[PDB]
Write a protein that binds this DNA or RNA. Structure first.
Lengths: 19, 58, 277, 226
RNA sequence: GAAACCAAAGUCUUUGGGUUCCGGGGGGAGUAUGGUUGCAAAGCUGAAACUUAAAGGAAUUGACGGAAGGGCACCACCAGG
RNA sequence: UAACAGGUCUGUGAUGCCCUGUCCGGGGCUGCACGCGCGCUACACUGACUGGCUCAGCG
RNA sequence: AUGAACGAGGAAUUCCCAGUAAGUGCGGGUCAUAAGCUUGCGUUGAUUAAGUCCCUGCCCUUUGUACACACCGCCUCGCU
């Protein structure tokens, strides 16, 4: 099931030698 | 009509048990092979004992 | 958590080095697999269990067996009860009671031969920590002082039910008999002072006012016993500072000290009449 | 209790089908707890009534104590000259016996009774919890209890199972003849412990473009590739 | 502009005002190694072998056991006969 | 004029399909351990027996 | 000619707000003869209430927020 807009989901923070 | 009534009341009992289970986990811690296809009843099986159904408690 | 795998239990029993005349103290009996295996493999099995229903389950499971009379169940919290004599200890321990219980096993008399312990990976690695490791703590130095420890085998948690949070591990421990001639209250008090801030130097660790208060109390006790006249201009902190420079631990930090350095520090402080009790 | 006066007790003793069926679930209940053979055990009879199940227990050599609230049941049980002892009381107030007393417990059609609130002071869930806790108290550690019932819905079942699992009992329930109607009994037994190309053709179908017909040779290796 | 949106995030395939730092599929991995700063805690610099077919951003959406607000009914309830 | 979703009538398609009982005598029509539901009678003193007296309506 | 059970009936609920329930008798249909079903009729005539969604059943509005599905974490040992 797909949660709706009312469901709280926060946007993730993106952070040898030759010889 | 009565067959559907039996099916829905059995389904209601099963769903009531399956909804009993989650609060039992939270606040605290069936004869399918015995069906007779030709008619209503209960026929003996040779491999298994006399008909029964065990639903363990949590 | 209930350990269900039989072969890891067999490995614990085998590497525990049981004898037919041994007395086994078991903590955390679970559902009764290793309990009845110890009953088959030992003369007396002392299972400690707080919950009465688990005791009832164990008593039902051992009922009807010839080894039923060899089981004794201690009902209550294992931390407060007085443990009887045992030759070998085995334990499935929760995390929350893991650390003082080991010290109780370090302070149990008379001396036993071996103890096999289930621990969390964090606790197991802090238990065997070498100096310089980031997991070095008071438990590490105290258990390396009073006993000899070996991390044995890394245990998967599919063997338990329910499978715990962190991975599981097995620790083999035995106390040094005879123990080194170190007052353990004195040792633990000194280490408790030095590990208030582990990355801070011992000089700044001993500049603390609470440290000055406790050492003032103990030095007053020592002067009262031995009739030493205290000068009015006495400074306990100045005394501690100049002794610590006299020892060479002024610029060293508590996270990089081994057992021998703490032995030298305690010897110097006790020779100077400073005690921690 | 006021059903079972002298008249209804006289009805109860004079009922061939009822006596036969109480004997049948008494036998099934005694079979359902695994007490050892040739070991005379000590049992608690709940819903003894006239002592028909108690008479069956005395027939097999076991000793039992009956508990009931109706005086006429116990009077007719005495009149039937039973061998066990009787006690006049309600399970909802608690069974008054020491811990480690009963080697087994048999309740016959006595547990569906406490599922409804009849008085203002009464409470079904708390009475059932007190009943199950007192069962867990008076039973010896490692015993077994079989509890027979005819649930009229699943509300009684869920209340009974919650109060049973909250008082520390472990086990379950077994239904005799679940598919039948005349022989269906409830026994609460407790104790104190190619596919890829198929998906791609479907994907092309939802994108609305023309696709080949789907047949037997859809995903099939043509030949070895060297 | 992919869209949320932006008077700049515009004057951009009709592609050039000046100049600085910086990315090049996902991991390995801010790891190993060396250098360097710091009393220390740590800071700056920083791979490869290997492994994988993805990783990620934006927005519109039917059905969905159910859930909540109300209303009606003595074939529902309170008090009763 | 019109109309037959009511239809009827021994006619036409080698028209599509599926197959190759009457009278007579007797018994039985819940016979009953029961579970599953409606009814009548009463379980007495606000009553039962006996006798007397005196009031209706739909049909 | 005899007076069996029957001492107000433990846990599913049936019907009901005024000339109504209940008591009480009388007709029609079925009928060579039953008395037992259904319809009505009259007589004596009550208690409680002018309330509610607590349950049941039905009809609405909102929603796919709650549980569940889904996210992520945690996810068998023992020789050569």
């Amino acid at each position: 099931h797909r949660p709706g807009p009312l469901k709280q989901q926060n946007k993730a923070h993106k952070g040898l030698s030759r010889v | 009509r009565n067959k559907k009534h039996q099916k829905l009341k059995h389904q209601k009992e099963a769903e009531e048990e399956e909804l009993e289970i989650p609060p039992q986990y939270q606040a605290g811690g069936p004869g399918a092979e015995y069906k007779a296809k030709k008619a209503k009843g209960d026929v003996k099986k040779k491999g298994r004992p006399d008909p029964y159904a065990y639903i363990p408690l949590n | 958590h209930i350990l269900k795998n039989p072969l890891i239990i067999n490995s614990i029993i085998d590497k525990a080095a049981l004898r037919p005349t041994d007395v086994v103290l078991e903590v955390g009996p679970g559902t009764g697999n290793m309990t009845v295996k110890l009953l088959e493999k030992a003369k007396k099995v002392v299972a400690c269990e707080l919950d009465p229903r688990l005791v009832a389950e164990l008593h039902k499971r051992v009922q009807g067996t010839p080894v039923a009379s060899k089981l004794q169940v201690l009902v209550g919290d294992v931390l407060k009860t007085d443990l009887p004599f045992f030759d070998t200890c085995v334990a499935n321990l929760p995390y929350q009671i893991s650390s003082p219980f080991v010290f109780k096993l370090l302070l149990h008399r008379p001396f036993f031969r071996c103890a096999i312990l289930m621990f969390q990976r964090e606790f197991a690695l802090r238990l065997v920590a070498k100096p310089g490791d980031k997991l070095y703590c008071r438990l590490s130095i105290n258990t390396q002082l009073l006993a000899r420890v070996d991390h044995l085998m890394k245990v998967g948690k599919n063997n338990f039910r329910p499978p715990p949070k962190v991975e599981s591990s097995v620790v083999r421990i035995e106390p040094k008999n005879p123990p080194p001639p170190i007052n353990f209250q004195e040792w633990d008090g000194l280490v408790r002072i030095t590990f208030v801030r582990k990355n801070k130097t011992l000089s700044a660790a001993f500049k603390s006012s609470a440290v000055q208060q406790l050492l003032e109390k103990n030095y007053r006790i020592h002067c009262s016993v031995h009739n030493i006249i205290i000068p009015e201009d006495f400074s306990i902190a100045d005394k501690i500072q100049q002794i610590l420079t006299s020892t060479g631990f002024s610029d060293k930090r508590a996270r990089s000290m081994d057992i021998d350095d703490f032995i030298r520090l305690l010897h110097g402080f006790n020779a100077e009449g400073i005690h921690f009790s | 209790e006021l059903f079972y006066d002298e008249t209804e007790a006289r009805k109860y003793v004079r009922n061939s089908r009822m006596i036969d069926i109480q004997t049948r679930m008494a036998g099934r209940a005694l079979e359902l707890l695994y007490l050892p053979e040739n070991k005379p055990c000590y049992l608690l009879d709940i819903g003894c009534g006239t002592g028909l199940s108690g008479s069956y227990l005395s027939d097999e050599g076991h000793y039992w104590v009956g508990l009931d609230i109706s005086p006429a049941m116990l009077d007719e049980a005495v009149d039937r000259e039973i061998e066990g002892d009787l006690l006049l009381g309600d399970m909802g107030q608690g069974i008054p016996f020491k811990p480690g007393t009963f080697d087994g417990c048999i309740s016959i059609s006595a547990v569906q009774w406490l599922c409804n609130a009849n008085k203002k002071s009464e409470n079904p869930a708390k009475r059932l919890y007190c009943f199950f806790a007192s069962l867990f108290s008076v039973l010896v550690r490692g015993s077994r209890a079989v509890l027979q019932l005819y649930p009229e819905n699943s509300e009684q079942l869920e209340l009974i199972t919650t109060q049973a699992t909250k008082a520390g009992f472990s086990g379950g329930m077994v239904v005799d003849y679940p598919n039948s109607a005349k022989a269906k009994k409830f026994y609460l037994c407790l104790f104190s412990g190619r596919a890829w190309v198929l998906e791609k053709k479907e994907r092309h179908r939802r994108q609305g473009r023309e696709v080949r017909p789907d047949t037997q040779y859809t995903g099939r290796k043509r030949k070895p590739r060297f």
